[PDB]
Structures are given as structure tokens and as C-alpha cells.
Design a protein around this ligand. Structure first.
Ligand SMILES: [Mg+2]
Ligand SMILES: [Mg+2]
Ligand SMILES: [Mg+2]
Ligand SMILES: [Mg+2]
Ligand SMILES: [Mg+2]
Ligand SMILES: [Mg+2]
Ligand SMILES: [Mg+2]
Ligand SMILES: [Mg+2]
Ligand SMILES: [Mg+2]
Ligand SMILES: [Mg+2]
Ligand SMILES: [Mg+2]
Ligand SMILES: [Mg+2]
Ligand SMILES: [Mg+2]
Ligand SMILES: [Mg+2]
Ligand SMILES: [Mg+2]
Ligand SMILES: [Mg+2]
Ligand SMILES: [Mg+2]
Ligand SMILES: [Mg+2]
Ligand SMILES: [Mg+2]
Ligand SMILES: [Mg+2]
Ligand SMILES: [Mg+2]
Ligand SMILES: [Mg+2]
Ligand SMILES: [Mg+2]
Ligand SMILES: [Mg+2]
Ligand SMILES: [Mg+2]
Ligand SMILES: [Mg+2]
Ligand SMILES: [Mg+2]
Ligand SMILES: [Mg+2]
Ligand SMILES: [Mg+2]
Ligand SMILES: [Mg+2]
Ligand SMILES: [Mg+2]
Ligand SMILES: [Mg+2]
Ligand SMILES: [Mg+2]
Ligand SMILES: [Mg+2]
Ligand SMILES: [Mg+2]
Ligand SMILES: [Mg+2]
Ligand SMILES: [Mg+2]
Ligand SMILES: [Mg+2]
Ligand SMILES: [Mg+2]
Ligand SMILES: [Mg+2]
Ligand SMILES: [Mg+2]
Ligand SMILES: [Mg+2]
Ligand SMILES: [Mg+2]
Ligand SMILES: [Mg+2]
Ligand SMILES: [Mg+2]
Ligand SMILES: [Mg+2]
Ligand SMILES: [Mg+2]
Ligand SMILES: [Mg+2]
Ligand SMILES: [Mg+2]
Ligand SMILES: [Mg+2]
Ligand SMILES: [Mg+2]
Ligand SMILES: [Mg+2]
Ligand SMILES: [Mg+2]
Ligand SMILES: [Mg+2]
Ligand SMILES: [Mg+2]
Ligand SMILES: [Mg+2]
Ligand SMILES: [Mg+2]
Ligand SMILES: [Mg+2]
Ligand SMILES: [Mg+2]
Ligand SMILES: [Mg+2]
Ligand SMILES: [Mg+2]
Ligand SMILES: [Mg+2]
Ligand SMILES: [Mg+2]
Ligand SMILES: [Mg+2]
Ligand SMILES: [Mg+2]
Ligand SMILES: [Mg+2]
Ligand SMILES: [Mg+2]
Ligand SMILES: [Mg+2]
Ligand SMILES: [Mg+2]
Ligand SMILES: [Mg+2]
Ligand SMILES: [Mg+2]
Ligand SMILES: [Mg+2]
Ligand SMILES: [Mg+2]
Ligand SMILES: [Mg+2]
Ligand SMILES: [Mg+2]
Ligand SMILES: [Mg+2]
Ligand SMILES: [Mg+2]
Ligand SMILES: [Mg+2]
Ligand SMILES: [Mg+2]
Ligand SMILES: [Mg+2]
Ligand SMILES: [Mg+2]
Ligand SMILES: [Mg+2]
Ligand SMILES: [Mg+2]
Ligand SMILES: [Mg+2]
Ligand SMILES: [Mg+2]
Ligand SMILES: [Mg+2]
Ligand SMILES: [Mg+2]
Ligand SMILES: [Mg+2]
Ligand SMILES: [Mg+2]
Ligand SMILES: [Mg+2]
Ligand SMILES: [Mg+2]
Ligand SMILES: [Mg+2]
Ligand SMILES: [Mg+2]
Lengths: 205, 121, 82, 80, 157, 129
RNA sequence: UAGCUAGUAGGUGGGGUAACGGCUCACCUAGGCGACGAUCCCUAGCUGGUCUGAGAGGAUGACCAGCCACACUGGAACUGA
RNA sequence: CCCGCAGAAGAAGCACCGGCUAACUCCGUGCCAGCAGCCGCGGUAAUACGGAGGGUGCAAGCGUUAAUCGGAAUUACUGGGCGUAAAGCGCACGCAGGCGGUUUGUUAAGUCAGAUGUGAAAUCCCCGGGCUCAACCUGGGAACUGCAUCUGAUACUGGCAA
């Protein structure tokens, strides 16, 4: 159901920073990033065309915290939906509640936001929600309940979100822990690094 | 070819025979087992491959390979058979399921133990 | 005898009745002449709840079709002037 | 109008009945070529009006034997 | 305007009195990503020397490809040796859904999204020629308009 | 032994263009003049005649733009061994609508483009790319 | 599997069927089906569909829905709309 | 379904890692023991066997087996062939059958167009809606590629003349 292993290991294998152990401090410099996936980390990979597709897929999964069964279901919805298949894959991932709760700044990491969603803290449109996979519809108002409001984990985690890029598609109040999801996320607004095309290539065959 | 020739005699679809006659699309089948014995393979190999004649329940009489190191099979002993050619012993086109029935698990395995029917350490 | 009765579809603990014109001898979910609206007991106060096409009811009740104990109550529920 | 069928006679040697072929030019489902398919019906007629080798109009009606549910309407283009 | 890439590398033998000497063959295709394509075979004793020899021939052996926006004009065949090769234009959506070797030549040419399939044999050399034979052949509406001497709109519309 | 005359016409055009030949003589017919005129009207062929009283010989005059011929490819679809009649909506479009398919419809012989707008289908004689 | 077929194929008349009919009789005629596959043999419930496929097709017909068939095996009628 | 309690507490495996195919070393063994979906690994320095470490891929599932289609344009109607690769009967005549030069007719069988009836509901598909989300249920639409009849069209094909 979840990964729950060594989290920074995933970042070295992938190479780039996945925001798995982003947390309170900004930059890590505490793993030998890039040049140590495992024991044989100095081994330069040949890396085939199937490889780069699989690496790109596993990167996007590990960032958002989704497994292949649920991830392959996002592709099947993305294909049936209008527009472009690549843009739909990532737009559906960004619409998850655990992802939105992270992007609002109610969680230092995405795993922290996931637990915060799961443990009856998060509440949207006057209704409590436990499901991390909850597809946040356009024009919504996610927030934290008054019992768990201003607890020790959230106030520190919200100060981290000032250093972050902060999305344009959503807005945060910051005083009373109240968020507002407005429009669907655009491609050019976020990332500008994770390739969608290669993930579409993995599943079409 | 020739559309009139096809109207008169349609495309006869190649009914490709199955590799493993166990019948009625069965995953596995019981076998009472007779003659447990060793046999030599084809050309580049050279070994003593462990194998047994299986008296299947439906009527058939087939040979099946005994995978892993060492076995408890002898004379009789009821065993379970799955499909799979060995590709070395010509004629042997089945495998004994290690773990099922009188066929025990392989002794002292760690890696790949669903294959070879061994429990945790 | 033709009769207007509920069909019972929907999930477990989550019923959804298709009110339908069928022969008395045919099974509940089985054969029918034509469906004529629906009923949802777990709908509550929202947009949709219960629909019942009253034009087709005149074609069957006017000729000679019985109305079941529950469907007769939904004709009273939909009302003539309320 | 009455739902008739044209058809050339195959034989009339039965006493008050006639067997009539109906050539229908349907196409082949798979291969798309048009086939010349045949439909031999048994047909009723009062007296020996029609002979061998001539076109005949035929109507569907009551069954009046084992086979022979079709019945004659009129004659068009007699035998050569 | 490089956009150069390698399809296949394949070692090939000669056999002489002494023994057998191995050389390597490359197969590179290059293009600007805007209607120019060029395969180059190239062979040499060593592997990396073969690909530079291939990349040199690929640049000079170039063919023009008149294509619509980021896709083909019409469904096109292009037979060569034992590779049939079929490829349909397709719409603004999708990506290049084609086989390896057949999609190296397509992506560097500048077609962003096409249907495609290699029937027959799928030898990397012959399928790359089979595509380029098709893409050279693949005429545009502006060419067809001038060819008959009628009108660009009356043909199209 | 000469079963399809229309296929034979379309070979003489095809083989004449391969040879780089100016004119293409052949026996005339009702269906020959109808197809030849449709090819002329759009602009594959550059003028033709039907010279003869008793034994008429319809000769075409093939068109060339560059060194290459104008008729890229031309093939029989509804051959006599297998007649092919397509419905209004199911009518084809050769080369994604920049080549024509000559189609014998109920209101005379015409192109596939004119058949769509006129509101009818028929026997698709030949694709012309 | 190349010929099968004598109530068999049709008529007139009587009986019988809720209803028409070789449904069944008596006589009369000599047919009828058959290479666009009868007869015989092996296999099979059928459809809406399911799965697959770019589509054509290929496979399949558990669950839900229609129709048929059968009820220990082989027969017959009684009762009844 | 809600609310209080107690404390990370009760809650992770099992495939694989020579190429196809994402991921490598070291010991043990020595064409033995064994592996193997295809090619193939093992003959004393094994990335392929067994263990160990390390990795990769899935994760309350995972693999193995069997079963169908796909890829297979490897029964090819869309879409293959038959000089030498599998494949022109040894060569004729010829009925049934398939196909048929050319111009007038003329019907309307095919063909085409239109129109009405029907193609049960579910299923599929699209826009909604309801279960905290999903699967699931569900409203409406489209569709059900069809078959029938009915009116027309005559270019083509058939028929019948000349
Ligand atoms: Mg799960
Ligand atoms: Mg799950
Ligand atoms: Mg595919
Ligand atoms: Mg063919
Ligand atoms: Mg009944
Ligand atoms: Mg109530
Ligand atoms: Mg009868
Ligand atoms: Mg010499
Ligand atoms: Mg091949
Ligand atoms: Mg004339
Ligand atoms: Mg004359
Ligand atoms: Mg004349
Ligand atoms: Mg009765
Ligand atoms: Mg279906
Ligand atoms: Mg599907
Ligand atoms: Mg599909
Ligand atoms: Mg296919
Ligand atoms: Mg079937
Ligand atoms: Mg069946
Ligand atoms: Mg089944
Ligand atoms: Mg059952
Ligand atoms: Mg059930
Ligand atoms: Mg049941
Ligand atoms: Mg049933
Ligand atoms: Mg019935
Ligand atoms: Mg019945
Ligand atoms: Mg019964
Ligand atoms: Mg019964
Ligand atoms: Mg019973
Ligand atoms: Mg009985
Ligand atoms: Mg009985
Ligand atoms: Mg009673
Ligand atoms: Mg009675
Ligand atoms: Mg009665
Ligand atoms: Mg604690
Ligand atoms: Mg613990
Ligand atoms: Mg030792
Ligand atoms: Mg030794
Ligand atoms: Mg030895
Ligand atoms: Mg030994
Ligand atoms: Mg192994
Ligand atoms: Mg070898
Ligand atoms: Mg050695
Ligand atoms: Mg060693
Ligand atoms: Mg090795
Ligand atoms: Mg291996
Ligand atoms: Mg090993
Ligand atoms: Mg090992
Ligand atoms: Mg690991
Ligand atoms: Mg591990
Ligand atoms: Mg499972
Ligand atoms: Mg499984
Ligand atoms: Mg299989
Ligand atoms: Mg196939
Ligand atoms: Mg196969
Ligand atoms: Mg072949
Ligand atoms: Mg030949
Ligand atoms: Mg030969
Ligand atoms: Mg030959
Ligand atoms: Mg010969
Ligand atoms: Mg002879
Ligand atoms: Mg003919
Ligand atoms: Mg003819
Ligand atoms: Mg003619
Ligand atoms: Mg003829
Ligand atoms: Mg003529
Ligand atoms: Mg005239
Ligand atoms: Mg006229
Ligand atoms: Mg006229
Ligand atoms: Mg007229
Ligand atoms: Mg008229
Ligand atoms: Mg007609
Ligand atoms: Mg008419
Ligand atoms: Mg008329
Ligand atoms: Mg018609
Ligand atoms: Mg029509
Ligand atoms: Mg119509
Ligand atoms: Mg329906
Ligand atoms: Mg379907
Ligand atoms: Mg919802
Ligand atoms: Mg909602
Ligand atoms: Mg619905
Ligand atoms: Mg509906
Ligand atoms: Mg509708
Ligand atoms: Mg339907
Ligand atoms: Mg249907
Ligand atoms: Mg219809
Ligand atoms: Mg009709
Ligand atoms: Mg009519
Ligand atoms: Mg009329
Ligand atoms: Mg005429
Ligand atoms: Mg004619
Ligand atoms: Mg005529």
C-alpha cells in the first residue's frame, strides 16, 4: 500500500531530488547524491530505451507516492479523457488530496501530508476525507479541522512552504490553515523537468 | 488467393496442437508415479537428470521432471504434475510440483522457495 | 395479469428500484413489457429522488393493469396537484 | 401491395402443385463477392397452368400441406 | 541542426587464411526536426570509428520531406527489399507509435505523431530506407495543386 | 481474354506514363468517355478526342509537370471478379482527399468529392493518386 | 459419409385438432429432397453479450436478462385456461 | 457514521538481477550437483548453478501452471504467395459453374437515395449524479454496424429484346 523503506535511497537511484525527504531543512548534502544508487554506484549504466522509460515512470510514481496498479489506472483514465494523454496523466496526479495538502503547505513532505489526510485532520467542503487518492475537483476548499488545527507538525511545516515555489493554480490563507483549490493545474506551471512522453511510451506498448 | 476460390473453399485456420496433453484445460494433475530413475540429456549437457514415469488419473502415462536437489519420490508416492518442458531430456514434457502431496520441499533452500515448495527459515 | 411493480436493482444495502410494467407470472427482475420511471429510497433531499412517467400509466391502468402496494404509494407521492 | 416474389419454375409434375426456384443475388459476408444463391419453394396452383422453365409470381399464405405454404398469384412470361 | 542518433550497431566477419577479422557496422539517421532526413550506414574496424563514418555519410545523404505542421499528409507505403512499411498521418494528439529504427528516422525528420507499422522483415537498414522511400514519395497538397494546374482550394475543400 | 475493358484503359494510361509517351490510343466506349472526361475535368489528362464512326478510337493525351508524370498511381477497385459498391457515408478518400476515386453513381459517372455533396454513393471504379 | 426416401411427395373423401396441415386414414397419381451438400457420422443448448482486436476478424456463451430443452430411466394419458 | 480512550504500539512479504528485460560482487561447486520462456549456462577465476551481500520490480499480494486473443501480413476479405526458399496438375478436350467486346432500347433483380417500423432491458460508449474516494450503483444521450417494408435514381451489373 505504501513504500515505507529508505526514502533518500530512491532519490540517488533516480538522480534528481524527488522531495521525499525534503522536510524542514532546504538542501540535504548528506547521501552522496547521484553517484551512489547502491553498492555498485560507480557503475555507469548503459541504459536502454526501455530503461529511460522505466526510470522516468518510477520517478513520477515515487515523487507522488503511487503504486503501479493505481498508476496504470491513471493512464487508462488519461487516455479516455480529452486533450492530450501526457498532460492528463500528470494533471490527475496533481489533483490528489495528499498532493494538494503538500502543495498548500500542510506537511513538510508528501508522506506527512498523506498521513495528515489519513488521520482525520484534513477536511474539504465541510466534509472530512481520509483518502489520499481523493480527486480534488475544480473550485474546492481544503482545510484542517479545529481539534487538530495549529498542532506542532503543521505550524513548522507551513514555514517551509515559504521557501517553496508555491503553485499559481491554488491559494492558501496561512492564518487559519484554510486552503482553496481553484483551477486545474497547467503543464507549464509545474515541474518543467519530469517527462510525460516517455511514460506514455511505456504503457502504449 | 483468387476471391472465387475462397468463396468455394474458405481459409482453413491452422489448428495448432497443444504441447502438454493433460486434457480439459487443467493446470495440474495427480499421478500415482512408477519407476523413479536417472537419464542422460542431449548433446552439449551431460548429467544424470532425475525423472519419473507418472501414471495420471485420467488414463495417461507421461514422464515428469523432478526439479531441485534431492527428492523423496520412490516406487509409488502420489505426486502433482504441472506443465513445462525441460528441453534437454527429449520426451520429458512435465514437471513435478515440489511441495504438493507426497513430493516434499527441497532441503535447505533460501532464494526462490515458491518454486521448490519450501517454507520460511 | 399485467402489473406495475418495482424490480430491485442496485448494490448490497444500497437499493434502487426500477418501477416497471410486467406480467405477474414473470420474475421480479426478469421479463417486462416496458419500464416506466424509477424509485430510489436512499436518495434523500437533493436534485433527483423519484421519477414516474404518468402518460404511460394511463395506457396500462386505463386498459387493465394492477398497481403494486409500493408503486400505488408513489403515484400518491408524485401527486396530481402537489 | 401484396408481398409477392418472382421466381423461375423448376418442375410441375405433382398434380395441383409446383416447385419454384427464386434466384437471389446476395453478397458473401467475409469475401464481399456477390453470389447467385437459390431458394426452392413448394407452391400451390389450381390445375396445371404453369409448365417447366418459366417465371412465376408467388405469395405467402396458409400452410396447406407438409411443406408448400406458398401459393400462386399469376403467370408472367410463359414457357419458351 | 544536428538531432543525430544511432539505430543499430552490428559486428560482421570476413574470414581469411589466418582466422576471422571482425569489423562493425553502424546505422545513424540525422535530421533538423523540420522536414529533412538522412540515413548513413558507415562501417569500420572499431565501434566508435564506425559511427563517425556513419554520421558523416548521414549528413550528406539527406532527403527533403514536405510535411503538415508536425505530421504526414496522407497514408503512405514505401517498399524496400523485404520491409513493407506503412504509416498514417494521424491528428494533433498522440505521439510517435512506431517500431525502433522506424521511429528514430521519424522523430528526427520532425513528425511529432503518426501511426506506423513495419510488415515483412524488420532489418534495421532496410526499414530505415523503406521509411525514407515513403517520406520522399509523400507529396503535399501544394505540389499536387501545381502538378495539375487547377487550384489549391478546389482540390482541398 | 479481355473481360475488363476499363482496367485495360487504366493500364494504358499507367504504362504510357512510365514510357514517357505523349498520346494513348484505344477502343472507345460509353464508360470509357465518362471516365476519361472525369480524369480530364480535374486535371490528370490534357485533352482527348473520339475520332471514328464505325470503329471508334478514343486517344488520350497524357500530362507531365516535371520529368515525373502527373498520374502517380492508378488502379482498378471494382473489378469484374469482385464488384465493390460503397454507401454514401462509406465512400473512400484517396490519399486523404488529394487524390480522387472515380465512382459510378445513379446520376452519371462522377468523383468521390462530388458524390458526397450530391448525396449518393455507387460503384467505385478506380482510385487515382 | 453420394445418394437418401413409401405416409414417403401431391390429390379427393371421411374422421380428428382450440386452430390449418399425411396431423391421421382409405383410395388415386409417382413423386420429393440431392453437388447453393440431401442422407449418415462426430460435436454442440441458443441469443443480448463477454474477453480480445487499430479495425476486420478470433475466441467464448460462468454471473445479470429473453427463448428452448429436461426433472431417477422408459413410456402413456387424466386434470385443467 | 460520529465522539472519548491507550500507545508505534497489533499490521510485509516474493519474484527476479548473462541477452531478450529494469538490477552486481564474493564465496561454495567443478559438463557433477543443478538451471532453462527462447538462445543457451556448469569441464577448478560461473554475473546463468547453491548460498551470502547488494540491487531491481511489484507489493497484501506475488510469482508458477493452464486457458483465449494479440504481436502472427505465420489461412493474408481489409492484408501473403507459387522460376531457384513450401507451392503450376505431365498435357489436352469439355458439361455444370465463374467471368465476358460493343450500341440502342426496356425493366428495376442487384446497386444507390430517402422514409417509416423494428434491432427487449442490461452491457459498451459520452455528459451528469449518488455512495467520505474508488470499484460499485445510477439519470439522460448516442449507439444497437442490422432486418423488413415503402417510395424514388438508371451510372454501373443483371434480365429481356433489337
Ligand atoms: Mg491493492
Ligand atoms: Mg490499493
Ligand atoms: Mg499494443
Ligand atoms: Mg489476398
Ligand atoms: Mg414462458
Ligand atoms: Mg423517507
Ligand atoms: Mg406442418
Ligand atoms: Mg589470397
Ligand atoms: Mg520474417
Ligand atoms: Mg456513346
Ligand atoms: Mg459500324
Ligand atoms: Mg458507334
Ligand atoms: Mg390449448
Ligand atoms: Mg460487446
Ligand atoms: Mg478492450
Ligand atoms: Mg480495443
Ligand atoms: Mg491485428
Ligand atoms: Mg458459438
Ligand atoms: Mg458454443
Ligand atoms: Mg466458461
Ligand atoms: Mg451455472
Ligand atoms: Mg448470483
Ligand atoms: Mg445460479
Ligand atoms: Mg437465465
Ligand atoms: Mg417460444
Ligand atoms: Mg417454441
Ligand atoms: Mg418439457
Ligand atoms: Mg417442463
Ligand atoms: Mg431433478
Ligand atoms: Mg420420465
Ligand atoms: Mg414422461
Ligand atoms: Mg385451473
Ligand atoms: Mg381437457
Ligand atoms: Mg383452452
Ligand atoms: Mg507516543
Ligand atoms: Mg515495533
Ligand atoms: Mg572450502
Ligand atoms: Mg573433478
Ligand atoms: Mg563428473
Ligand atoms: Mg559424477
Ligand atoms: Mg534461478
Ligand atoms: Mg550453438
Ligand atoms: Mg573454467
Ligand atoms: Mg570461485
Ligand atoms: Mg557467465
Ligand atoms: Mg537468467
Ligand atoms: Mg547466481
Ligand atoms: Mg545462484
Ligand atoms: Mg532494495
Ligand atoms: Mg531487496
Ligand atoms: Mg493477486
Ligand atoms: Mg496471478
Ligand atoms: Mg501462455
Ligand atoms: Mg491473424
Ligand atoms: Mg501462435
Ligand atoms: Mg509467404
Ligand atoms: Mg501464377
Ligand atoms: Mg520447390
Ligand atoms: Mg511455379
Ligand atoms: Mg507445367
Ligand atoms: Mg494424369
Ligand atoms: Mg455473369
Ligand atoms: Mg454477363
Ligand atoms: Mg458489358
Ligand atoms: Mg452470364
Ligand atoms: Mg457494353
Ligand atoms: Mg444515351
Ligand atoms: Mg434512357
Ligand atoms: Mg428508360
Ligand atoms: Mg424507368
Ligand atoms: Mg418506372
Ligand atoms: Mg432493386
Ligand atoms: Mg421497385
Ligand atoms: Mg417502380
Ligand atoms: Mg437493395
Ligand atoms: Mg440502402
Ligand atoms: Mg437506407
Ligand atoms: Mg439494448
Ligand atoms: Mg465491441
Ligand atoms: Mg463522486
Ligand atoms: Mg460529489
Ligand atoms: Mg446508465
Ligand atoms: Mg437509457
Ligand atoms: Mg436513442
Ligand atoms: Mg443491444
Ligand atoms: Mg447487436
Ligand atoms: Mg438501422
Ligand atoms: Mg427485399
Ligand atoms: Mg421495392
Ligand atoms: Mg411500384
Ligand atoms: Mg442504360
Ligand atoms: Mg451493359
Ligand atoms: Mg443493360
Amino acid at each position: 500500500a505504501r513504500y515505507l523503506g529508505p526514502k533518500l535511497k530512491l532519490s540517488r537511484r533516480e538522480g534528481t531530488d524527488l522531495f521525499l525527504k525534503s522536510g524542514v531543512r532546504a538542501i540535504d548534502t548528506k547521501c552522496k547524491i547521484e553517484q551512489a544508487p547502491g553498492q555498485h554506484g560507480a557503475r555507469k549504466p548503459r541504459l536502454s530505451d526501455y530503461g529511460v522509460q522505466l526510470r522516468e515512470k518510477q520517478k513520477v510514481r515515487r515523487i507522488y507516492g503511487v503504486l503501479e496498479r493505481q498508476f496504470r489506472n491513471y493512464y487508462k483514465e488519461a487516455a479516455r479523457l480529452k486533450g492530450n494523454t501526457g498532460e492528463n496523466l500528470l494533471a490527475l496526479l496533481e489533483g490528489r488530496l495528499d498532493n494538494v495538502v503538500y502543495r498548500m503547505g500542510f506537511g513538510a513532505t508528501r508522506a506527512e501530508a498523506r498521513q495528515l489526510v489519513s488521520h482525520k485532520a484534513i477536511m474539504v467542503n465541510g466534509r472530512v476525507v481520509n483518502i489520499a487518492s481523493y480527486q480534488v475537483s475544480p473550485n474546492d476548499v481544503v482545510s484542517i479541522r479545529e481539534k487538530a488545527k495549529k498542532q506542532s507538525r503543521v505550524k513548522a511545516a507551513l514555514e517551509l512552504a515559504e521557501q517553496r515555489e508555491k503553485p499559481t493554480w491554488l491559494e492558501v490563507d496561512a492564518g487559519k490553515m484554510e486552503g482553496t483549490f481553484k483551477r486545474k493545474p497547467e503543464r507549464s506551471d509545474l515541474s518543467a523537468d519530469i517527462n510525460e512522453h516517455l511514460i506514455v511510451e511505456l504503457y502504449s506498448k | 488467393a483468387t476471391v472465387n476460390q475462397l468463396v468455394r473453399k474458405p481459409r482453413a485456420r491452422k489448428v495448432a496442437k497443444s504441447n502438454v496433453p493433460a486434457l480439459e484445460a487443467c493446470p495440474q494433475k495427480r499421478g500415482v508415479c512408477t519407476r523413479v530413475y536417472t537419464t542422460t540429456p542431449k548433446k552439449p549437457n551431460s548429467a544424470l537428470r532425475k525423472v519419473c514415469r507418472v501414471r495420471l488419473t485420467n488414463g495417461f502415462e507421461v514422464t515428469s521432471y523432478i526439479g531441485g536437489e534431492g527428492h523423496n519420490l520412490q516406487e509409488h508416492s502420489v505426486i502433482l504434475i504441472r506443465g513445462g518442458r525441460v528441453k534437454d531430456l527429449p520426451g520429458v514434457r512435465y514437471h513435478t510440483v515440489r511441495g504438493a502431496l507426497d513430493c516434499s520441499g527441497v532441503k535447505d533452500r533460501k532464494q526462490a522457495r515458491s518454486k521448490y515448495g519450501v517454507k520460511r527459515p | 395479469m399485467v402489473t406495475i411493480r418495482l424490480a430491485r436493482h442496485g448494490a448490497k444495502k444500497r437499493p434502487f428500484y426500477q418501477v416497471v410494467v410486467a406480467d405477474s407470472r414473470n420474475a421480479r427482475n426478469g421479463r417486462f413489457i416496458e419500464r416506466v420511471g424509477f424509485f430510489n429510497p436512499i436518495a434523500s433531499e437533493k436534485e433527483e429522488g423519484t421519477r414516474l412517467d404518468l402518460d404511460r400509466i394511463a395506457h396500462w391502468v386505463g386498459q387493465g393493469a394492477t398497481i403494486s402496494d409500493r408503486v400505488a404509494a408513489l403515484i400518491k407521492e408524485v401527486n396530481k396537484a402537489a | 401491395k401484396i408481398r409477392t416474389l418472382q421466381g423461375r419454375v423448376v418442375s410441375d409434375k405433382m398434380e395441383k402443385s409446383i416447385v419454384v426456384a427464386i434466384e437471389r443475388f446476395v453478397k458473401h459476408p467475409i469475401y464481399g463477392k456477390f453470389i447467385k444463391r437459390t431458394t426452392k419453394l413448394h407452391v400451390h396452383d389450381e390445375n396445371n397452368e404453369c409448365g417447366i422453365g418459366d417465371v412465376v409470381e408467388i405469395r405467402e399464405c396458409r400452410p396447406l400441406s407438409k411443406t408448400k405454404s406458398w401459393t400462386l398469384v399469376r403467370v408472367v412470361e410463359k414457357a419458351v | 541542426e544536428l538531432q543525430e542518433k544511432l539505430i543499430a550497431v552490428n559486428r560482421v566477419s570476413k574470414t581469411v587464411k589466418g582466422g576471422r577479422i571482425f569489423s562493425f557496422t553502424a546505422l545513424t539517421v540525422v535530421g533538423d526536426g523540420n522536414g529533412r532526413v538522412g540515413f548513413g550506414y558507415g562501417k569500420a574496424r572499431e565501434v566508435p570509428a564506425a559511427i563517425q563514418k556513419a554520421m558523416e555519410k548521414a549528413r550528406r545523404n539527406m532527403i527533403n520531406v514536405a510535411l503538415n505542421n508536425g505530421t504526414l499528409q496522407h497514408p503512405v507505403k514505401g517498399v524496400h527489399t523485404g520491409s513493407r512499411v506503412f504509416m498514417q498521418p494521424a491528428s494533433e494528439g498522440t505521439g510517435i507509435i512506431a517500431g525502433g529504427a522506424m521511429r528514430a528516422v521519424l522523430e528526427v525528420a520532425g513528425v511529432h505523431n503518426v501511426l506506423a507499422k513495419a510488415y515483412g522483415s524488420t532489418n534495421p537498414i532496410n526499414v530505415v530506407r523503406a521509411t525514407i522511400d515513403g517520406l520522399e514519395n509523400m507529396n503535399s497538397p501544394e505540389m499536387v495543386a501545381a502538378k495539375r494546374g487547377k487550384s489549391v482550394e478546389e482540390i482541398l475543400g | 481474354s479481355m473481360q475488363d475493358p476499363i482496367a485495360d484503359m487504366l493500364t494504358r494510361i499507367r504504362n504510357g506514363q512510365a514510357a514517357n509517351k505523349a498520346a494513348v490510343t484505344m477502343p472507345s466506349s460509353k464508360l470509357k468517355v465518362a471516365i476519361a472526361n472525369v480524369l480530364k475535368e480535374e486535371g490528370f489528362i490534357e485533352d482527348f478526342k473520339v475520332e471514328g464512326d464505325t470503329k471508334p478510337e478514343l486517344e488520350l493525351t497524357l500530362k507531365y509537370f516535371q520529368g515525373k508524370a502527373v498520374v502517380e498511381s492508378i488502379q482498378r477497385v471494382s473489378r469484374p471478379g469482385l464488384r465493390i459498391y460503397k454507401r454514401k457515408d462509406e465512400l473512400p478518400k484517396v490519399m486523404a482527399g488529394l487524390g480522387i476515386a472515380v465512382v459510378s453513381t445513379s446520376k452519371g459517372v462522377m468523383t468521390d468529392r462530388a458524390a458526397r455533396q450530391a448525396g449518393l454513393g455507387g460503384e467505385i471504379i478506380c482510385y487515382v493518386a
